[PDB]
Design a protein around this ligand. Structure first.
Ligand SMILES: Nc1nc2c(ncn2[C@H]2C[C@H](O)[C@@H](COP(=O)(O)OP(=O)(O)OP(=O)(O)O)O2)c(=O)[nH]1
Ligand SMILES: [Ca+2]
Ligand SMILES: [Ca+2]
Ligand SMILES: [Ca+2]
Length: 341
DNA sequence: GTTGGATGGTAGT
DNA sequence: CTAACGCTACCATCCAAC
């Protein structure tokens, strides 16, 4: 079983560099402007030149401009990037039909019926890098291993414009030596909990009672870590089915005034329903980000599908419910559809 | 004692 | 207005309904 994972380099910024080669070789920062005030919002990504200065995905645009004033700041055009992504995804498709698209910029290929071993895998990975570079002028990072998790870990180790194989012996070693925090799915919270039990490496999970481990971090997370640690994790490549779709927007200013909020909510509904496109949801949730950035939410599941008209009516009821049961001012408002038929 | 919908926490973006 | 997008996925906990 061999899995080939491709993850495009500084994707949004790189697309813009391809669309405008004069940008190449300079700091570039792609931004999600919230509309709230001048330069309100956060950064989607930035190129490696910008990262040298601390500018990276997630930080506030005002933090970016503070530490890197003279960079080029462009707004995010997701649709433009999505078009390039789909074209690349189809190139990937001509090397393997067995493909898992995980984000706008990455995908997992099962290549066990195309290559004999890790060498031929690596050569395929160089072939794939070349093709994407010729056809779209995008550089990507390939990670090859016996499974999805390790293909992703391998890519992470080789980022910008690399390629890396983690073969079976290195898996054994990484199960022993890789800091547990560096395992996909273990964030800050879960890392702390694993330190309190003195569990620092994947191998440390095989020397602890299942029941004691599941109590601390949860059943699913325990079964995941133990499975990895046993060298048994083997989730296969499967087409991803979108489970939920929605839209959230930042308001020009905080409010508890229904008539002031409604317009934003109704925009979120229209654009959500456009993104649904054929799908019929049975569950709707209204999501509100309060003045102190806490996320609160009210929803409802129907026994049948939700029509646009019901989405308008219920979302208003749900938003009324949030205002009734929570006293803080609202700052962002959104909606989310799930349980598709 | 067991389902699953409502709500929220954690993760990776 | 004065920092903190916009998104998706998965799972834990609560607690009325079984
Ligand atoms: N809005 C938003 N978009 C993000 C965020 N993180 C990543 N993205 C978008 C922009 C990225 O170009 C694209 C792919 O993200 P990646 O996580 O793979 O990082 P990126 O390609 O930008 O740099 P790379 O060398 O992987 O690290 O997804 C984020 O926090 N917010
Ligand atoms: Ca990625
Ligand atoms: Ca990337
Ligand atoms: Ca971590």
């Amino acid at each position: 079983g061999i899995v080939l994972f491709v993850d495009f380099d500084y994707f949004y910024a790189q697309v813009e560099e391809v669309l405008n080669p004069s940008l190449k070789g300079k700091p570039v920062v792609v931004c999600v402007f919230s509309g709230r005030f001048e330069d309100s919002g956060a950064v989607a990504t930035a190129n490696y030149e910008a990262r040298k200065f601390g500018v990276k995905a997630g930080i506030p645009i005002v933090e970016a401009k503070k530490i890197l004033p003279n960079a080029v700041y462009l707004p995010m055009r997701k649709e433009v990037y999505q078009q390039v992504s789909s074209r690349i995804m189809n190139l990937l498709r001509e090397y393997s039909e067995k493909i898992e698209i995980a984000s706008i910029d990455e995908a997992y290929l099962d290549i066990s019926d195309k290559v004999r071993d890790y060498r031929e895998a690596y050569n395929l990975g160089l072939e794939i890098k070349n093709k994407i570079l010729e056809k779209e002028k995008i550089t990507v990072t390939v990670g090859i291993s016996k499974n999805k998790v390790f293909a992703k870990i391998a890519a992470d180790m080789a980022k910008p414009n690399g390629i890396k194989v983690i073969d079976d012996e290195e898996v054994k070693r990484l199960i022993r030596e890789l800091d547990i925090a560096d395992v996909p799915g273990i964030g800050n919270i879960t890392a702390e909990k694993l330190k309190k039990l003195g569990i620092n490496k994947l191998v440390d999970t095989l020397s602890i009672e299942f029941d004691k481990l599941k109590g601390m971090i949860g059943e699913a997370k325990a079964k995941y870590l133990i499975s990895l640690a046993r060298d048994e994790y083997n989730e296969p490549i499967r087409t991803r089915v979108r489970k939920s779709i929605g839209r959230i927007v930042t308001m020009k200013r905080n409010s508890r005034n229904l008539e002031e909020i409604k317009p934003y909510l109704f925009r979120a509904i229209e654009e959500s329903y456009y993104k649904l496109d054929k799908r019929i949801p049975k569950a709707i949730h209204v999501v509100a980000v309060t003045e102190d950035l806490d996320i609160v939410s009210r929803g409802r599941t129907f026994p049948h599908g939700i029509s646009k008209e019901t989405a308008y009516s219920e979302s208003v009821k749900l938003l009324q419910k949030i205002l009734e049961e929570d006293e803080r001012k609202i700052r962002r408002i959104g909606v989310r559809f799930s349980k598709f038929i």
